[PDB]
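Subject: design request, 582 residues
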């Protein structure tokens, strides 16, 4: 208890310490140059080593909050660069750290991070490994100031491994670009999934978040007793509140406490944690969050005894409605690791609605008896959408699946900008690639994890620049209704076709040389524009026009005179297409 900074140095070790301190300063000091933060991290590291040698030395006795805040207040250009943030230095703890948190900028004005050429990256990696890796760690942390530093650190070690492996290969590019791409997607998805959990907490409140956490922990930890899940759900909520406010030291400490609690009580929680509970303090929390679902106990009774068929259902409910509803959710969820969390919550809200209505009626048991009937169609709707979409994904490419989604979603919401329709259809295509490789036992949770992210992204974007009442309705819907609401969108009956623009459907020989990704984006853009222009086109008409386009590109990219034929065969393509459509 003597030196917080000594204790975290000894626990983390110097290399992790230095990294996290760099991430933390970069999350706060987003416009400070790399060399200035490196010098702060080395001074903080020197000071922490005085506390490691003497837990009683000067200032070693201070809160990490206090030490962190004082270091920020030694920044010479604090007022010049960050303006009103420098006024936090005029306060004392805990007001100062509160004031610093109040001034973390969610979207700094920083240019997109452009990935250098593989050979350039590998020369840089070989020439100064430490500086190469620390600099991009800085670039990411300063652009992602709420991304949990220990997890940003876990990604950085995977990036290091990819460089170490691939800067061996003869084709550096063919090894490295696929590992970097997958790491980036997992990075972005991890950050999204955190933002989703903060939106549940922040937009729907503590009850909705705790319902969400009971279901998810009950699927993960099915041998856990309900009181043990209730306890974990309380602690989860404080971790997420702090993490959501973006207070790294408070969040880190609530996580370490919960990760120590879980590891002291494995036999009450899960047989899947032995691995995770061997790992250092730094990762242990993170390993737990990733653990595989435990096998559920054999010989579980059906839910009907307690929830459905018992005398005492209305009595037990009315005593403590949230506690009984929480029990139902735990019993349902621990039996159905194959259900989405949201599906389980839709069932618990149906059960709740039933008991509200049935417990007031003449024959309560007559009324609440039939409830499992209303559950079947709730379960079947997401299972059938997944079946139908994965069948379509299997029939078509990943790429032609995307094109099918672009036609579908453009006809439903043609007021959405082209670039966004292309990025939503392309991301949805990627959810089909990822989750259709699961067996149906694991599809619904996969689809939930990745669709909720796409839908949060879409709703954030739409809140900033709204274009459709129907999307506002779906985005402001209840947590359980959002995805069904988007699923219920029909073809827009009222949309005014977009006016013909020859420029939009004119191609050049440039298309032949473009990268695959970029060629696919140029064609998917034109397909959206075709649909905004001919929204009544049938799947036969659009398919006819797209195959003529495809024959036209295959003809014109192999022609003696590329440009002439792109121009002349282009005018014919446009004319035939207009006549055939609308
Ligand atoms: C996506 C996973 O469900 C993460 C999980 C969780 C579950 C429900 C709501 C929030 C988060 C999760 C944690 O984030 C966690 C963090 C620290 C310590 C233990 C944890 O256990 C966990 O299951
Ligand atoms: C201690 C945990 C008690 C949890 C309360 C369970 C209530 C489940 C009812 C369904 C409400 C789901 C929340 C939502 O509307 O998003
Ligand atoms: C399989 C990905 C292709 C994209 C669109 C298909 C969406 C299927 C909806 C699945 C819903 C699961 C979560 C829920 O219970 O609402
Ligand atoms: C402006 C975005 C396009 C509108 C569609 C939003 C994305 C679809 C999300 C729901 C998809 C679930 C599968 C479905 O039922 O189509
Ligand atoms: C009315 C103007 C008509 C012009 C042609 C429209 C072009 C849209 C084509 C997109 C089809 C891509 C399929 C493929 O990959 O080959």
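Subject: RE: design request

Done. Sequence follows.
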């Amino acid at each position: 208890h003597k030196s917080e900074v000594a204790h975290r140095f000894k626990d983390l070790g110097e290399e992790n310490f230095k990294a996290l301190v760099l991430i933390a300063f970069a999350q706060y000091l987003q416009q400070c140059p790399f060399e200035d933060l490196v010098k702060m991290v080395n001074e903080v590291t020197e000071f922490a080593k005085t506390c490691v040698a003497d837990e009683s030395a000067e200032n070693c006795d201070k809160s990490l909050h206090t030490l962190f805040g004082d270091k920020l207040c030694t920044v010479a250009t604090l007022r010049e660069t960050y303006g009103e943030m420098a006024d936090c230095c005029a306060k004392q703890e805990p007001e100062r750290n509160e004031c610093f948190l109040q001034h973390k900028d969610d979207n700094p004005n920083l240019p997109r991070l452009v990935r250098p050429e593989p050979d350039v990256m590998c020369t840089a990696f070989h020439d100064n490994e430490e500086t190469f890796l620390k600099k991009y760690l800085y670039e990411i942390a300063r652009r992602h100031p709420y991304f949990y530093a220990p997890e940003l650190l876990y990604f950085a070690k995977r990036y290091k491994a990819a460089f170490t492996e691939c800067c061996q290969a003869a084709d550096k590019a063919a090894c490295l670009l696929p590992k970097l791409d997958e790491l980036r997607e997992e990075g972005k998805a991890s950050s999204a999934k955190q933002r989703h959990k903060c939106a549940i907490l922040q937009k729907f409140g503590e009850r909705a978040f705790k319902a969400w956490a009971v279901a998810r922990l009950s699927q993960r930890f099915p041998k856990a007793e309900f009181a043990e899940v209730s306890k974990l759900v309380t602690d989860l909520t404080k971790v997420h509140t702090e993490c959501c406010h973006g207070d790294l030291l408070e969040c880190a400490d609530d996580r370490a406490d919960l990760a120590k609690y879980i590891c002291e009580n494995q036999d009450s929680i899960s047989s899947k944690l032995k691995e995770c509970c061997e790992k250092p303090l730094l990762e242990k929390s993170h390993c737990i969050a990733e653990v595989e679902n435990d096998e559920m106990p054999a010989d579980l009774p059906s839910l009907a005894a307690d929830f459905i068929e018992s005398k005492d259902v209305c009595k037990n409910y009315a005593e403590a409605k949230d506690v009984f509803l929480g029990m139902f959710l735990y019993e349902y969820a621990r039996r159905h690791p194959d259900y989405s969390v949201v599906l389980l919550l839709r069932l618990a809200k149906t059960y709740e609605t039933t008991l509200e209505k049935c417990c007031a009626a003449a024959d309560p048991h007559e009324c609440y008896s039939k409830v499992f009937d209303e559950f079947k169609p709730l379960i079947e709707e997401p299972q059938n959408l997944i079946k139908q979409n994965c069948e379509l994904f299997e029939q078509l490419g990943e790429y032609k699946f995307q094109n099918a989604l672009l036609i579908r979603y453009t006809k439903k919401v043609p007021q959405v900008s082209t670039p966004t329709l292309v990025e939503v259809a392309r991301n949805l295509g990627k959810v089909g690639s990822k989750c259709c490789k699961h067996p149906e036992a694991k599809r619904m949770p996969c689809a939930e994890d990745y669709l909720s992210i796409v839908l949060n992204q879409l709703c954030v974007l739409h809140e900033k620049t709204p274009v459709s009442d129907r999307v506002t309705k779906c985005c402001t819907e209840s947590l359980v209704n959002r995805r069904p609401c988007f699923s219920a969108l029909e073809v827009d009956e009222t949309y005014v076709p977009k006016e013909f623009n020859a420029e939009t459907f004119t191609f050049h020989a440039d298309i032949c040389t473009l990268s695959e990704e970029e060629r696919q984006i140029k064609k998917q853009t034109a397909l959206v524009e075709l649909v905004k222009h001919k929204p009544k086109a049938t799947k036969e008409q659009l398919k006819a026009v797209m195959d003529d386009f495809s024959a036209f590109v295959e003809k014109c990219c192999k022609a003696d005179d590329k440009e002439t034929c792109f121009a002349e065969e282009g005018k014919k393509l446009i004319a035939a297409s207009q006549a055939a459509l609308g």
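Residues 303-386 form a domain with the Serum Albumin; Chain A, Domain 1 fold (CATH 1.10.246.10).
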